[PDB]
Amino acid sequence: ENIQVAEITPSTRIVYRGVSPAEFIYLEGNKFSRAQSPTQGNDDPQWKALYTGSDANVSSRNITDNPGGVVKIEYPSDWKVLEITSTTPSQKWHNDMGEAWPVWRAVKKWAASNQVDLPDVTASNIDDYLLLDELGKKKIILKKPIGEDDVSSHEFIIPWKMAETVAQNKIDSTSDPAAKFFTPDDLDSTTKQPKDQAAVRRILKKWDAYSCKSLCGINVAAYKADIEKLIKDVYEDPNFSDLKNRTGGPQKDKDTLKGYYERLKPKVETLRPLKAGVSSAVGAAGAISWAIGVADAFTSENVSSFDKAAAVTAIVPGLGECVGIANAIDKRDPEGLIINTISMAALMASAAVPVLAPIGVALDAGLAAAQGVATVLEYLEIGQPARTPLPVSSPKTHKGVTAAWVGSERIIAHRPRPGMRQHIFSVSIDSSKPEYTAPLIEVAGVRADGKLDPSPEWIRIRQNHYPIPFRFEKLSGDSPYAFRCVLLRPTTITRTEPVYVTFAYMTSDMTCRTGESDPNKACSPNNPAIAVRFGSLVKNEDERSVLAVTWPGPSIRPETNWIKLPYSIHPY
Length: 572
Ligand SMILES: [Ca+2]
Prior knowledge:
This protein has 572 residues and is of the alpha+beta class. It has 15 helices and 23 strands. The chain has helices at 21-27, 56-60, 100-112, 131-136, 160-163, 197-212, 224-236, 241-244, 254-271, 284-301, 306-314, 319-323, 334-352, 362-378, 543-547, and strands spanning 3-8, 14-19, 50-53, 69-74, 80-86, 140-147, 150-158, 171-172, 393-398, 401-406, 411-412, 420-429, 438-439, 442-446, 452-454, 460-462, 470-474, 482-487, 492-493, 499-507, 529-533, 562-566, 569-570. The longest helix is centred in the middle third of the chain and has 19 residues, at 334-352. The protein is globular, with a radius of gyration of 26 Å. Keywords: Calcium, Metal-binding.
């Protein structure tokens, strides 16, 4: 057996839970209710329950969209807390932790020597004994690691019948005002979701802040005032009047931009000298290369506003080779380096982009680039120790980015019966360019209605202590049937911080069928695959173009910014 269960006695019987605005409003004046939950916490009956987190941060960063806030739950002392553990001391995670049958065996083994009577669940009759419902008849909750990519954080799984017995005064939604990310006027009463992007940005700020309440590292926002003044000081210097008064199209000549670089780098270090011994991390070749990228981005996307120009800057590839601090930063003067490198980044962009009337003068583009660059770096844990990445298999590289599977990518329909199944892949930077970076813009996957149903509640995109919002979408079309997750703030792949994507699906008795003439069509969807995009769209190529078995691929279409990972589906 791979997993085991043992009762623990926690020092604090306090869990947390991230909720949408509607649920946060509900919980302020009602108790938890299975009927009020549209999914009952999980598409899989074995797992239907109330899910909670081991601390406020884990719950905060496992909201994936439409964040409302985080509530604090105090559960009774008489509840038995059963922790799922690996039988191998080296391995803290095992995929059996997620499968109803192995877990069933593990609690049965514990119950037998601990005076708890549980049904005689078998691989045959498992459909008749739903795990969490059955533990709810016995005063049991489950403690479990969040996932293979977050083994040190844990979810507490609370059977609904017990969740419903928690008193109201034990559900805290008020003592910390920062745990409530929205105000009522931010939402539409009919949808009870944010009215507009202004609201979404406001909620995101409170969401981000709470998730790091610092756990996230350097607060890049703390230096916007300095960076803005600094850039403005440069543009008032008479020696830079040629930048200040520049009009017309972009400047992408590498000699020309190098000339600005060597005029700008010393100037920036004068306005905010770095502390003794510390040196600038900006490189000529990367800044020139990156600035050209911003200029190409400004033209192609016709930026009609400051924020549009800032957004476009945040998803330009190669920022890490220009700022030099995407993966590490000199701890002797982190503030000075942040102020120094962003300012350099934005000034170089201001020298290369076209000067578009909607933006303003060249200075305005520079300031817009600074906001964009700062947003990118804000979500990287610079200056904190680098994480050991998860081992991968079957990698595929394109334009310096690498997608690969963590563990097994196969989706088995019966294990031993249908249920919630999942696979995980990582998006990494290829180490040949150790400081390269690229945006994660969207991920997509095949589906089959009634056969392989993506579970939007349990899809996750993970990197560090920040949440990673995305919008889940079931797409139109039958060739193939597909879904996409659109990331909702600048999400950046780095060497030291790859992004982990978990896709969860429900399988059914209809996933695989017998009797078909071709053994490869026995399971739907046929030709299964996922896809990750880290650059601009190619005309007439969307996620459904790539997922299709008819996609030409990166060799025929090297301009693409997609990587496609196939996987296989099997009945048992
Ligand atoms: Ca930060």
